[PDB]
Amino acid sequence: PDLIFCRKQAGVAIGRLCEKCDGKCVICDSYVRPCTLVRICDECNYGSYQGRCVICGGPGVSDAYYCKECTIQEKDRDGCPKIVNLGSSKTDL
Amino acid sequence: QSKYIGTGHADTTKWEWLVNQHRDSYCSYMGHFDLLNYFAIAENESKARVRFNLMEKMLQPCGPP
Amino acid sequence: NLPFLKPDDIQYFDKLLVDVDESTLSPEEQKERKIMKLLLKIKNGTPPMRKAALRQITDKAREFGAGPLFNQILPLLMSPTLEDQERHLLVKVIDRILYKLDDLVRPYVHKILVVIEPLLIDEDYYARVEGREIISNLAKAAGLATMISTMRPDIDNMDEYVRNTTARAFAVVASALGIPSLLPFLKAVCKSKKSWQARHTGIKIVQQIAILMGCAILPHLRSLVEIIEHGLVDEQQKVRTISALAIAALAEAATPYGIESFDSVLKPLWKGIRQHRGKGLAAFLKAIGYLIPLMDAEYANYYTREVMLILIREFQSPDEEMKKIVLKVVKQCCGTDGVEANYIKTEILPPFFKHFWQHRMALDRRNYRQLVDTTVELANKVGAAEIISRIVDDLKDEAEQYRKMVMETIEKIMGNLGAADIDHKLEEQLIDGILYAFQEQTTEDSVMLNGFGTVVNALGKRVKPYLPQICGTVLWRLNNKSAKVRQQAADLISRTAVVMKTCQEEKLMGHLGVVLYEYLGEEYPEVLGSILGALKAIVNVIGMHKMTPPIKDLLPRLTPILKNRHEKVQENCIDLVGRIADRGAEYVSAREWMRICFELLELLKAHKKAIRRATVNTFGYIAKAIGPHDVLATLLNNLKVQERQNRVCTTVAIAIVAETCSPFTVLPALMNEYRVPELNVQNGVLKSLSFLFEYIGEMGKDYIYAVTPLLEDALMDRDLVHRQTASAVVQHMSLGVYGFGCEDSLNHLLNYVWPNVFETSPHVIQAVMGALEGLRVAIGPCRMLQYCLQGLFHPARKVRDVYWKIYNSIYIGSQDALIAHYPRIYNDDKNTYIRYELDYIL
Amino acid sequence: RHMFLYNLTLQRATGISFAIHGNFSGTKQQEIVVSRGKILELLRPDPNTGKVHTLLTVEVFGVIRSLMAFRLTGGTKDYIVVGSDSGRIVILEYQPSKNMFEKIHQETFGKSGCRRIVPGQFLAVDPKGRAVMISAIEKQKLVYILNRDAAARLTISSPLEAHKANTLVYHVVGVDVGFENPMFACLEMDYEEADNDPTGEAAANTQQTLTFYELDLGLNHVVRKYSEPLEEHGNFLITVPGGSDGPSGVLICSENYITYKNFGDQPDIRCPIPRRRNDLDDPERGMIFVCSATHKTKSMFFFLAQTEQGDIFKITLETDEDMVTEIRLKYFDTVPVAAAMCVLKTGFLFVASEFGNHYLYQIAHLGDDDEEPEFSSAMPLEEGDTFFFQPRPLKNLVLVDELDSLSPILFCQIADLANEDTPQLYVACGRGPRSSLRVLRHGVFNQVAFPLQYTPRKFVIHPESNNLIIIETDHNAYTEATKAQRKQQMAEEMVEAELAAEMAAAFLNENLPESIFGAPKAGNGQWASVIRVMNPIQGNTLDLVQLEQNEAAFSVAVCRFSNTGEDWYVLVGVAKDLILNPRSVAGGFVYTYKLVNNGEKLEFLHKTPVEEVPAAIAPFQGRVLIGVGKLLRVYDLGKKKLLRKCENKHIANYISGIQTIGHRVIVSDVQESFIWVRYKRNENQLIIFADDTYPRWVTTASLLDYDTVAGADKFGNICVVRLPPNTNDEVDSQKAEVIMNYHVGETVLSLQKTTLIPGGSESLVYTTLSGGIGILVPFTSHEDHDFFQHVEMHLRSEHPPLCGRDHLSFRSYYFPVKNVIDGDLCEQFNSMEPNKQKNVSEELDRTPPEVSKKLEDIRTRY
Numbered sequence A: 001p002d003l004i005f006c007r008k009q010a011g012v013a014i015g016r017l018c019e020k021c022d023g024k025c026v027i028c029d030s031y032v033r034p035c036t037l038v039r040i041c042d043e044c045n046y047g048s049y050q051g052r053c054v055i056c057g058g059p060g061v062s063d064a065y066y067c068k069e070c071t072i073q074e075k076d077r078d079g080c081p082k083i084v085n086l087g088s089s090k091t092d093l
Numbered sequence B: 001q002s003k004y005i006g007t008g009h010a011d012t013t014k015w016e017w018l019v020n021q022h023r024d025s026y027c028s029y030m031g032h033f034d035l036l037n038y039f040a041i042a043e044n045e046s047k048a049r050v051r052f053n054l055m056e057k058m059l060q061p062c063g064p065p
Numbered sequence C: 001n002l003p004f005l006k007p008d009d010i011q012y013f014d015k016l017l018v019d020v021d022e023s024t025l026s027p028e029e030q031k032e033r034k035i036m037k038l039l040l041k042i043k044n045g046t047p048p049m050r051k052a053a054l055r056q057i058t059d060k061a062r063e064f065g066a067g068p069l070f071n072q073i074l075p076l077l078m079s080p081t082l083e084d085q086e087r088h089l090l091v092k093v094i095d096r097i098l099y100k101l102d103d104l105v106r107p108y109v110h111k112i113l114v115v116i117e118p119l120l121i122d123e124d125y126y127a128r129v130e131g132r133e134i135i136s137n138l139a140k141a142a143g144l145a146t147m148i149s150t151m152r153p154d155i156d157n158m159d160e161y162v163r164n165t166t167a168r169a170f171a172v173v174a175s176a177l178g179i180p181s182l183l184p185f186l187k188a189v190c191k192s193k194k195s196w197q198a199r200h201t202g203i204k205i206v207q208q209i210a211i212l213m214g215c216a217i218l219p220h221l222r223s224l225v226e227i228i229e230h231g232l233v234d235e236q237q238k239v240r241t242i243s244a245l246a247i248a249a250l251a252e253a254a255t256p257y258g259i260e261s262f263d264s265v266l267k268p269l270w271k272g273i274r275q276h277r278g279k280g281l282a283a284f285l286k287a288i289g290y291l292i293p294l295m296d297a298e299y300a301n302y303y304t305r306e307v308m309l310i311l312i313r314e315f316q317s318p319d320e321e322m323k324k325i326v327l328k329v330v331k332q333c334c335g336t337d338g339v340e341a342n343y344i345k346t347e348i349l350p351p352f353f354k355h356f357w358q359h360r361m362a363l364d365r366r367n368y369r370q371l372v373d374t375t376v377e378l379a380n381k382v383g384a385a386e387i388i389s390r391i392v393d394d395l396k397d398e399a400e401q402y403r404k405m406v407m408e409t410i411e412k413i414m415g416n417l418g419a420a421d422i423d424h425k426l427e428e429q430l431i432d433g434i435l436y437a438f439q440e441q442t443t444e445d446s447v448m449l450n451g452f453g454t455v456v457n458a459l460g461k462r463v464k465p466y467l468p469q470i471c472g473t474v475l476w477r478l479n480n481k482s483a484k485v486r487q488q489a490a491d492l493i494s495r496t497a498v499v500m501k502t503c504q505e506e507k508l509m510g511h512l513g514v515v516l517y518e519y520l521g522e523e524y525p526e527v528l529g530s531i532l533g534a535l536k537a538i539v540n541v542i543g544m545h546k547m548t549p550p551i552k553d554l555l556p557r558l559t560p561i562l563k564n565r566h567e568k569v570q571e572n573c574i575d576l577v578g579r580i581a582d583r584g585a586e587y588v589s590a591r592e593w594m595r596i597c598f599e600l601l602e603l604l605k606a607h608k609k610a611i612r613r614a615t616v617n618t619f620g621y622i623a624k625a626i627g628p629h630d631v632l633a634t635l636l637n638n639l640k641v642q643e644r645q646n647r648v649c650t651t652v653a654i655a656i657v658a659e660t661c662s663p664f665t666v667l668p669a670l671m672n673e674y675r676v677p678e679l680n681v682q683n684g685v686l687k688s689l690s691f692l693f694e695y696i697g698e699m700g701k702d703y704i705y706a707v708t709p710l711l712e713d714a715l716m717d718r719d720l721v722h723r724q725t726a727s728a729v730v731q732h733m734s735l736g737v738y739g740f741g742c743e744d745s746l747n748h749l750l751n752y753v754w755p756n757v758f759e760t761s762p763h764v765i766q767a768v769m770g771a772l773e774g775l776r777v778a779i780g781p782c783r784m785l786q787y788c789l790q791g792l793f794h795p796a797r798k799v800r801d802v803y804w805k806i807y808n809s810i811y812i813g814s815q816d817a818l819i820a821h822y823p824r825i826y827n828d829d830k831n832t833y834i835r836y837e838l839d840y841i842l
Numbered sequence D: 001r002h003m004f005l006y007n008l009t010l011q012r013a014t015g016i017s018f019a020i021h022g023n024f025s026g027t028k029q030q031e032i033v034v035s036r037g038k039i040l041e042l043l044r045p046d047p048n049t050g051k052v053h054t055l056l057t058v059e060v061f062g063v064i065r066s067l068m069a070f071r072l073t074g075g076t077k078d079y080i081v082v083g084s085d086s087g088r089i090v091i092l093e094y095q096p097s098k099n100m101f102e103k104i105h106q107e108t109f110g111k112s113g114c115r116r117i118v119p120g121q122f123l124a125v126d127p128k129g130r131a132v133m134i135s136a137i138e139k140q141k142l143v144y145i146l147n148r149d150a151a152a153r154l155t156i157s158s159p160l161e162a163h164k165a166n167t168l169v170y171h172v173v174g175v176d177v178g179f180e181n182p183m184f185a186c187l188e189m190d191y192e193e194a195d196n197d198p199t200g201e202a203a204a205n206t207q208q209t210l211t212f213y214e215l216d217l218g219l220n221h222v223v224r225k226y227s228e229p230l231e232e233h234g235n236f237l238i239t240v241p242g243g244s245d246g247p248s249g250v251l252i253c254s255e256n257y258i259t260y261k262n263f264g265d266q267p268d269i270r271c272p273i274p275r276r277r278n279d280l281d282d283p284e285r286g287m288i289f290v291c292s293a294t295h296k297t298k299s300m301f302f303f304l305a306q307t308e309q310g311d312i313f314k315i316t317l318e319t320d321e322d323m324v325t326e327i328r329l330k331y332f333d334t335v336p337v338a339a340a341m342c343v344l345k346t347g348f349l350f351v352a353s354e355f356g357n358h359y360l361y362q363i364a365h366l367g368d369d370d371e372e373p374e375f376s377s378a379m380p381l382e383e384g385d386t387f388f389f390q391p392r393p394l395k396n397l398v399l400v401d402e403l404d405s406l407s408p409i410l411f412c413q414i415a416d417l418a419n420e421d422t423p424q425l426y427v428a429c430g431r432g433p434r435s436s437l438r439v440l441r442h443g444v445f446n447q448v449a450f451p452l453q454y455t456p457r458k459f460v461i462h463p464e465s466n467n468l469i470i471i472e473t474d475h476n477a478y479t480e481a482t483k484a485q486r487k488q489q490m491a492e493e494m495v496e497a498e499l500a501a502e503m504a505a506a507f508l509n510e511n512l513p514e515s516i517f518g519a520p521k522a523g524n525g526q527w528a529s530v531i532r533v534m535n536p537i538q539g540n541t542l543d544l545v546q547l548e549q550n551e552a553a554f555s556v557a558v559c560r561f562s563n564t565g566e567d568w569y570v571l572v573g574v575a576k577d578l579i580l581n582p583r584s585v586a587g588g589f590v591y592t593y594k595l596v597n598n599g600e601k602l603e604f605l606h607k608t609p610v611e612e613v614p615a616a617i618a619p620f621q622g623r624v625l626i627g628v629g630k631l632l633r634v635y636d637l638g639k640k641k642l643l644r645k646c647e648n649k650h651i652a653n654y655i656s657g658i659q660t661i662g663h664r665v666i667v668s669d670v671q672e673s674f675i676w677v678r679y680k681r682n683e684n685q686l687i688i689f690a691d692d693t694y695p696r697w698v699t700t701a702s703l704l705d706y707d708t709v710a711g712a713d714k715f716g717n718i719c720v721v722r723l724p725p726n727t728n729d730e731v732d733s734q735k736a737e738v739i740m741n742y743h744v745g746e747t748v749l750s751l752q753k754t755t756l757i758p759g760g761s762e763s764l765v766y767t768t769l770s771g772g773i774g775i776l777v778p779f780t781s782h783e784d785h786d787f788f789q790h791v792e793m794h795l796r797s798e799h800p801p802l803c804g805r806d807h808l809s810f811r812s813y814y815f816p817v818k819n820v821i822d823g824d825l826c827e828q829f830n831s832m833e834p835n836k837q838k839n840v841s842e843e844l845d846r847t848p849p850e851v852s853k854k855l856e857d858i859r860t861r862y
């Protein structure tokens, strides 16, 4: 499976995470010190993807956060952290 | 990365790197107020004239390759 | 090749299944074939395929033409089995081809609107969004005149459905091109001499413009009102109704500004209040209710007093829509500055509570919510008691829905305004009615629990006399055959524990706790979690010595409850154990604490976030209680014993102990375990160091020097994973102690991390790059540029590749900071390289 | 001993880089929001007394690069949009009740720092408040849409990309297009052509363009519609009023021209800038506008455009139903060069000068009915000449208030020169004709200013007479003698072309005051320098020496000599024909003067020539130490010239300053850090024995003891570097340890270890090129250090900087913070809400009033 980050210009949409991957950070897979709120671009939030989990893609339950380490390194200032799989379309799963 | 202007690779020439860092320096001057103040004190010109001269230098800050 | 085809895709892409040659294919027919192929790649395809097909279909849209393009696109958009995301992709490709085909779509506009307009009335919100978007792109492509020509004949249509749809589409094209661009057309159509359907449709256009654009209307509100105002005195009744509703929509959109734009509408509505009846009267009242909150205080008072006669008259109306309209109007009037509280108490409240507050209103849920919210808003201005006393006696009623209604009303009122306005008589009435309403419940309505808790917490110390009366009911409720009622009683205890403690009735709370202690064997997990939360709320407010049962008896009973698989039981049991350990640690032996701690370690790898949070907090509590050494010895033992994810709990617990107790009590023993020659346990020690420093953060500022030798040993060729985890440790250190004067030891560790930059294995070089970026933020980009310049330009190409990767990371990380750190580059014969401005001297 | 300092700003920055006016209080009163650099300040000029009061001042801990105000449709209060050095844009609303800047919105889009392609440098809002646009100097620009909700609270949307690679943006401004789709006009230039032509032709062939970005609201996207090349390069744009009250379009301000342009069927109307009659400047020098202003009324609208010389011209456009016929300019007045001007309603003009004091004037005559010649674009013009006007003193404006500003501070000495118990701060600052030496006394500071002739570089104190020996030097300036000779040559040229015989006499008789009309400065390598001897008590100059038209003073030192008696001497280093950019100096000269009449007159003993510029002169054990270029020499007084006895050559780049303690000398390099050199008397040689591991653009230095040196960066940093223990100054290859690093956010040109209040704790006071004064106070115990450190930590997260910047990252701008606690942030504990104060104090196991008293206790020990 060949996955990547969206990395588009993020908007006013708040990132969201499901029950499986809740306290986890979207970038470095850490559970330590949730710092800055996750923003995503409008395309990743449109339609049936409203409030969808940023990592997997299931019913989100809590806001997504970068960790303190990624905030320090300004890894939140990059693009949209939405995980996209280049080997599927919009109807798969 | 190709998106971030100023990055490089194994085939980045000396001229490219130097003109990149010269443009970065000019933007830093335009941004930091006291840097511009120092530059406008050393040579007697208005802040507006200094900013205009820097924006003019932005073209070929080092010269043609 | 060709992507996958669903069953419904054959109907639209069968011709692509046969492998025929295009040289044989007829022209124009061949271009339609290529359109058919591009749309297949767009609809079903990977993101690269989709983007490439979008670029190919946009850059060649003119050569293809509007005809074949839309004749291929429209049947797909009407497919019954079309996914919503496929519809969105089609919407995007339509927008992108409309931007290129500027005016060529003019002959096809009609054929588009027969397909798109049904989306504007679809239940799916995003379907309406997509329809409005493509109609807007079409209105920007073709001219305004083309849209007006194509949509004008459908204005005076005989059917109301098509009139409504055309009005919505006209509103969409108005928001697309701008209000002034459609102002002359609307001014002409709203005064059409031919029929009344045309003026009704124009007014509907204005109403939908209001609804669609909201606050973006205020610049043209005067123009819209002056265009639409003549419709209130029209001969037709439906056009008067729709003009009133459009005025209401314009008022709602312009809230709270722009009252002066309605100067010509106040007297017409005022006269129509006394003239019209029925649906027209409802529309006039709705417009007045949405217009009032825009007025000044004195004029709001004047207009409200002017309309209140008919407003009260319409209270006893048989129509339900009329009832909802007048209730919304009351809520709007009594929530504005100018309508005084005494006026509402005198003229509005008696008929309000007479006609509205009836039993059958609590049956329908929309009327329920409307009346509840309106009554709460009334209490927000006229006072809490003046509203509660009028329906407090209805808490003792035979119909339970009415009791639930009055309970939720009182709950919201007292949660908004406290209990300062309630006298003693009303307090006794509240207590009696709430006790009767709680005692008699067909089912455990949560609204009753919320109301009880809110009223008790608002009364505070004033509920002291009624406390035995409440505790008796709670005790009788705990002894019930129904489990979901026992858990409701436990939740009530949880919510009222703090007030019971404030009321100085610790004996009653101790009796409650000793009653709960015997219920820990509940077979239903949710009631068990509720009673655990109740016990936690009782313990968290009463001293440990006074508490019954004694903590020494209660905690060993709580120990085996941690083995339950239910999330609620685990969370509440852990929270209670932690509240015990925080202040009652002296009542429990170290052996019991150790057994709890070892039964609590597995809960560190729970899947629910709250369970892990509670486990970490209570582990920190018990570590502060016992002391670091007794638990840390067995922690290191478990670490060397076990492997895999189960060990990560051991690592997290070691970090928790290192944070709670100061890290000097764990780091030496943690580093000792690195001495044994087993390569499997040294890696675990390194992982523990990594997570420990990441967890303590700035606290590790006094411990980089102590660990530096172990790291410089692990940075040597002991194993790949050794150096990987050591680089992870360096990264977490640098990010944690960043900005606390650790440049010496970190700059030293950089000399050991750097030789590992020429490594091919992916994970270890990724860890090395992470350590390098952490060291960049901690040491500064200056030292990083100093280490990078020596290899930035090098005869070897692999050296240049690696060093340029490093430099790119440094540059993206801190470009502005690098200005003061670049070296001197003397200018040669062909270029100027020295920055002369930085050489100025003052 | 470990060095842990507490940083406190005694005198906030007083310079101004941006100023906007508007109704920020929600009432009919109009206030002014100014940017002091790293401070955001609010001012209210009282229209009854004509004085400016300060209502609010906030440390934003960032670099404010842009600042504008906007208003929604039907709104009563103006919001405040700020673009910082952060990757964020912030929208603030002033609340007069709480007296604070409430951050209404904060949206992130990029990385922090004054970056090249990260938006923040340029900010342009739509005149109807519907959309704002934040742009960088290169490539990307972002458009946000602003609206309101049902509760009338501002709402911001997702950004809209308007990026274009290889594009340099000179200036962006919104266009008043009424209520159509908003539009933004940019002065852009593409450099992709210039970087691929090794001949340089594409560089001279590429030209500046005026481009227009339209935000389609119905389609919700930014499109780059028009892009017209410009004749000559413009420096900025002016938004002319549009819609129902004015013709939309733009005014491009160029060099010697101003052009109205508008898309559609509109001709380009350009007008040459009226040059000053009998201009004493260089004929090859051009004239540009430095700032602008716009005042709109229900009747008319006009612009105020200030030139390089300080001439404010009133600009009006002739309507001609819908296409402008002509641009009409007329000489309004003359004020000092300003970074921004605000034409307030109720008739007041706020002039925020680029340096020196700021001014507030009242308008009395709009220039309508005056005999002064008004200039237009339809007038016939040969293109070989331009319009001429005569500058006159103030007549349309009246001075009603003057705000004191120490910017720019070039040197400072803290000492008790007057016989008082508390020492005074003698600050040599100002620029050009508006320079001054100011005495500051605290008992916030109270100042008294004595004007100077040129920009002071460095001044020393005479130990015996307490008098100050200042050197003043300015580039491309004329000396007094050369100015008189130029006026004489112009009078000679004037008597041929017979009223000119009287006109030239009147011209020679009229000496325009340069303090109000600017100084006639021209030429490239020209330099005006003056040595002055002044009394600290009075404002009188005790002696003055003018120098050559090409001689520029850069160093000064008064000292006794062991070669002679206790009679003092004054050495002044001077460069000749410097030519700053590119650098190419001719030679240097050291003036040796004898000090007579107990420090009241200078006796020209001799002039000693030397290769390059003497940039540093310091006494050193009977003899003297002088730095020339990268050569550190020791000189001794001779009978006719200065005799060299020893030199050191291995200095890296260029000496910018030297200071000596004992037998060591600390050479400051222009780019590298300090160098510790040892002088052995018997061997009579200078041997470098220590250097540093970090390059530092040194500006000033101050030896704290025998092993530590505290220095300041050109980039706004303060460092403290100490030699390692057991460092014998005989062997080389010794590296010094950086024991303290801090970023002030402002360039420091004077560090000094002293004690302000007598007997108190010894502190380290620094001055600020932006007109500020700060202190670093050492910590006494680890308890206080840990307490204030935890206060800083908690305030970093509970009260973050106002303009999106991160405090720790900001103070770690160029080097990570090392052992400095930010007191400017800690004192913001008093500005928080009671809930956060109580929570943080409970986290520190004490009460909020106890924390406030602990903070106030530090502002007495300094």
Ligand SMILES: *C[C@@]1(O)C[C@@H](/C=C/C(C)=C/C[C@H]2CC[C@@H](NC(=O)/C=C\[C@H](C)OC(=O)NC)CC2)OC(C)(C)C1
Pocket (backbone or CB within 6 Å): A020, A021, A023, A024, A031, A032, A055, A056, C604, C605, C606, C607, C609, C610, C612, C613, C616, C648, C649, C652
């Ligand atoms: C999307 C996902 O990758 C999510 C993972 C889930 C993995 C789990 C639950 C691993 C166990 C792991 C959890 C973290 C460790 N403990 C821990 O961090 C404890 C406390 C922290 C600091 O507190 C909080 O986070 N509080 C909010 C223990 C080991 O599952 C898959 C399926 C891979 C999918």
Ligand SMILES: [Zn+2]
Pocket (backbone or CB within 6 Å): A006, A007, A008, A040, A041, A042, A043, A044, A080, A081, A082
């Ligand atoms: Zn995305």
Ligand SMILES: [Zn+2]
Pocket (backbone or CB within 6 Å): A017, A018, A019, A020, A021, A053, A054, A055, A056, A057, A058
């Ligand atoms: Zn998930």
Ligand SMILES: [Zn+2]
Pocket (backbone or CB within 6 Å): A025, A026, A027, A028, A029, A030, A066, A067, A068, A069, A070
């Ligand atoms: Zn992270």
